[PDB]
Amino acid sequence: AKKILVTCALPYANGSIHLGHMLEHIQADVWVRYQRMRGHEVNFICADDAHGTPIMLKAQQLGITPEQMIGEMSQEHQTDFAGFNISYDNYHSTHSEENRQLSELIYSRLKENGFIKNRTISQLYDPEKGMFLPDRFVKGTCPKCKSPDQYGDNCEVCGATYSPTELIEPKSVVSGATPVMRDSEHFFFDLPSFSEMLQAWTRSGALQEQVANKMQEWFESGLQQWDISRDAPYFGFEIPNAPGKYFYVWLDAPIGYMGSFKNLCDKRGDSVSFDEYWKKDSTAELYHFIGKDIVYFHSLFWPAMLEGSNFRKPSNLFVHGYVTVNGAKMSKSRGTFIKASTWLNHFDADSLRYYYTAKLSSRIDDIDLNLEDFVQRVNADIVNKVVNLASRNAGFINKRFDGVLASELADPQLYKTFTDAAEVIGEAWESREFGKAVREIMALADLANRYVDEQAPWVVAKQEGRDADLQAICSMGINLFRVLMTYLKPVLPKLTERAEAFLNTELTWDGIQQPLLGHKVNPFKALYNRIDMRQVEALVEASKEE
Ligand SMILES: N[C@@H](CCSC(F)(F)F)C(=O)O
Ligand SMILES: [Zn+2]
């Protein structure tokens, strides 16, 4: 039994979960549920990324403590993920005692190992508010076209880019006062020192081809030292021995993966698993599911930090692309910027889980949610191919045979074709070739429905003395359904629970080898209903209104 620790990127605490986040959490959950079905020890870990200036300032605007604000967002995030049945073993926070101790520990080891450098920098400073200003909190007039009210390092009118120090008549977005250049000592992590170690990992062949290719571009550009400190005022962890200095969010953020796991172990009263998973000699596997925008961070900075602090590194990084709706980036004006909570007001979790899974692969390509296609695919595959197998046969069994399935398989050869596919389908789930697994499963679903069509139960049912044949045909269809729902169990948790209640049995991967014979099933009300474009229209309109 393998020991596996799987994570999803930690969501920022200052924004609601949207369909973009869901692609990642659903992809990981499918993989995690499959690994659990194969008997491995799995720890699915996540948490909110709760530190930083943006958060501190938002809390101040709302007139509440950052602690209260992140606490509310944490609850909101978990409610949404729970609604999509993302099976985390623990969901913690980067703002925790566990993360504080681990951040201090790692920093101390990096400093002791000579990987921390002191450097003085110059940055825009708000003298009224009394704080250094990140680029996005500095506004002014574009140096090129002279357009007013531009933010950060770029102009939204002429498209020019520049240092905020070039803005004409600069103004603090926080207080409106004119910012000035101010010096401050910062602490940098010497990432360049790990260049050779990182280059070796890149060419090892573990990472996705597209990722390794990207990394070569970054090595070509040249690794730089990374600033891991921030001056007060700040919402985060104070740096030991450095009054007024805090750990920059990106230093403590990934350590949150560790903090969340330590929290889980501590709550379980488990005093050995943390070290067994994070020590350099660990035989456990560590996987991070992440999006394209944070690959540089997880593939270079993170492994380097772990190495420098004597901890094991990721076994692999699983990168997915962006989510688009109707072919384009989510658009608020078009109502395609959809929140996870909003989605659930209109559709169930299984529908989106299935759709995403049917399009996912082991590559980093973008995933498109075409709403028209969504309706067609769900109705065609879930309702008409898979659920149909149960709904078209269950009635006769319950009404004509007291809910009892036949004592033998009507077509053992066909059943073997279904069980024989477990190896390829499981390997598809394992390798993250989700689209391939779904295609294979639906191909079997087509074969199953062809079988039922060929036997014509609707004809046999009205013909005198054909009771035995009817029970045989319908029981065969239900057993094929049993196998299909087993392969789809990691994808559709809710439909699976309903299927298990109907079948009177928990679905296990190895269980398909023993078909249900002389077995009692229960009656069921709509296992899964059709959806329509009117619902999609409502979702879009509701999203526009938000
Ligand atoms: N909050 C970040 C992800 C943090 S993953 C970590 F490892 F950096 F914690 C984002 O949403 O992009
Ligand atoms: Zn301009």
CATH of the domain at 161: 2.20.28.20
DSSP 34-52: HHHHTT-EEEEEEEEB--S
State the distance from the centre of ligand 1 to the C-alpha of 9, rounded, in angstroms.
5
For residues 142 and 191, membership in a common domain is answered with no
Under DSSP, the state recorded for 401 is S
Q: Which of 146, 172, 198 is the last residue of a domain?
A: 172
Question: What does the alpha-carbon distance between residue 349 and residue 492 come to, in Å, rounded to a whole number?
Answer: 8
Question: What does the alpha-carbon distance between residue 98 and residue 115 come to, in Å, rounded to a whole number?
Answer: 23
For residues 185 and 285, membership in a common domain is answered with yes
With respect to residue 210, please indicate whether it lies within any of the assigned structural domains.
yes
The alpha carbon dihedral of 190, 192, 193, 194 has a sign of positive
Nearest-atom index, ligand 1, CA of 298: 7
- Beta strands 367-369 and 323-325, pairing class: parallel
What tokens does 426 get? 């499981």
With respect to residue 536, please indicate whether it lies within any of the assigned structural domains.
no
Q: Does the Cβ of 317 fall within 6 Å of ligand 1?
A: no
Question: What does the alpha-carbon distance between residue 171 and residue 145 come to, in Å, rounded to a whole number?
Answer: 18
What backbone phi and psi angles, to 5 degrees, belong to 438? Answer: -65, -40
Close Cβ partners of 347 (under 8 Å, ≥ 6 residues apart)? 531, 535, 539
Q: Does the Cβ of 253 fall within 6 Å of ligand 1?
A: yes
Residue with tokens 């805090």: 246
- Host domain of residue 331: 1-137+173-385
Q: Does the Cβ of 256 fall within 6 Å of ligand 1?
A: yes
- Beta strands 41-48 and 90-93, pairing class: parallel
For residues 244 and 364, membership in a common domain is answered with yes
State the distance from the centre of ligand 1 to the C-alpha of 175, rounded, in angstroms.
29
Residue (of 92, 110, 104, 114) closest to 47 by Cα position: 92
Q: Does the Cβ of 126 fall within 6 Å of ligand 1?
A: no
- Beta strands 180-189 and 226-227, pairing class: antiparallel
Q: Does the Cβ of 480 fall within 6 Å of ligand 1?
A: no
Query: CB burial class (10 A; 0-12, 13-18, 19+) of residue 77?
Result: buried
Nearest-atom index, ligand 1, CA of 94: 9
With respect to residue 406, please indicate whether it lies within any of the assigned structural domains.
yes
State the distance from the centre of ligand 1 to the C-alpha of 10, rounded, in angstroms.
5
Q: Which ligand lies nearest the alpha carbon of 157? A: 2
What is the domain count for the chain?
Answer: 3
Residue (of 213, 72, 187, 98) closest to 90 by Cα position: 98
Count Cα atoms within 13 angstroms, Cβ side, for 366.
Answer: 13
Is the N-terminal amide bond of 233 cis, ω within 30° of 0? yes
State the distance from the centre of ligand 2 to the C-alpha of 178, rounded, in angstroms.
20
The alpha carbon dihedral of 66, 71, 74, 80 has a sign of negative
Under DSSP, the state recorded for 56 is H
Q: Which residues surround ligand 2, an ion (CB under 5 A)?
A: 142, 144-145, 147, 155, 157-158, 160
Q: Which of 385, 413, 440 is the last residue of a domain?
A: 385
With respect to residue 128, please indicate whether it lies within any of the assigned structural domains.
yes
Q: Which ligand lies nearest the alpha carbon of 160? A: 2
For residues 230 and 379, membership in a common domain is answered with yes
State the distance from the centre of ligand 1 to the C-alpha of 12, rounded, in angstroms.
7
Solving technique for this entry?
A: X-ray
| Residues contributing to the annotated binding site | 142, 145, 155, 158, 332
Q: Which ligand lies nearest the alpha carbon of 162? A: 2
Q: Does the Cβ of 252 fall within 6 Å of ligand 1?
A: no
Alpha helices in 230-318 (DSSP H): 249-268, 273-278, 295-296, 302-308
Q: Does the Cβ of 190 fall within 6 Å of ligand 1?
A: no
Residue 307 near residue 313, CB atoms below 8 Å: yes
Taking CA atoms only, the protein residue closest to ligand 1 atom 11 is: 11
For residues 163 and 312, membership in a common domain is answered with no
Q: Does the Cβ of 12 fall within 6 Å of ligand 1?
A: yes
For residues 260 and 217, membership in a common domain is answered with yes
Report resolution in angstroms: 1.8
CB atoms within 10 A of CB 214: 18
Question: What does the alpha-carbon distance between residue 391 and residue 451 come to, in Å, rounded to a whole number?
Answer: 15
With respect to residue 307, please indicate whether it lies within any of the assigned structural domains.
yes
Residue 158 near residue 145, CB atoms below 8 Å: yes
For residues 274 and 259, membership in a common domain is answered with yes
Query: Ligand 1: which of 10, 237, 301, 302 to mutate, judged by most atoms within 8 Å of the beta carbon?
Result: 10
For residues 186 and 163, membership in a common domain is answered with no
Which CATH number does the domain housing residue 377 bear?
3.40.50.620
With respect to residue 543, please indicate whether it lies within any of the assigned structural domains.
no
DSSP 368-390: EE-HHHHHHHIIIIIIIIIIHHH
What tokens does 355 get? 């759709």
For residues 432 and 368, membership in a common domain is answered with no
What backbone phi and psi angles, to 5 degrees, belong to 511? Answer: -60, -25
State the distance from the centre of ligand 1 to the C-alpha of 262, rounded, in angstroms.
18
How large is the C-alpha radius of gyration of the chain? 27
Q: Does the Cβ of 294 fall within 6 Å of ligand 1?
A: yes
Query: CB burial class (10 A; 0-12, 13-18, 19+) of residue 528?
Result: buried
Nearest-atom index, ligand 1, CA of 290: 5
Question: What does the alpha-carbon distance between residue 162 and residue 164 come to, in Å, rounded to a whole number?
Answer: 6
Q: Which of 343, 368, 385 is the last residue of a domain?
A: 385
With respect to residue 530, please indicate whether it lies within any of the assigned structural domains.
no
Q: Which ligand lies nearest the alpha carbon of 159? A: 2
Question: What does the alpha-carbon distance between residue 211 and residue 231 come to, in Å, rounded to a whole number?
Answer: 34
CA angle 376, 534, 441 (to 5 degrees): 20
For residues 205 and 285, membership in a common domain is answered with yes
Taking CA atoms only, the protein residue closest to ligand 1 atom 6 is: 254
Question: What does the alpha-carbon distance between residue 188 and residue 501 come to, in Å, rounded to a whole number?
Answer: 57
CB atoms within 10 A of CB 119: 12
With respect to residue 539, please indicate whether it lies within any of the assigned structural domains.
no
Question: What does the alpha-carbon distance between residue 84 and residue 118 come to, in Å, rounded to a whole number?
Answer: 45
Residue 27 near residue 58, CB atoms below 8 Å: no
Q: Is residue 149 classed as helix, strand or coil in its secondary structure? A: coil
Which CATH number does the domain housing residue 440 bear?
1.10.730.10
For residues 39 and 111, membership in a common domain is answered with yes
For residues 109 and 215, membership in a common domain is answered with yes
CB atoms within 10 A of CB 179: 28
What backbone phi and psi angles, to 5 degrees, belong to 369? Answer: -100, 95
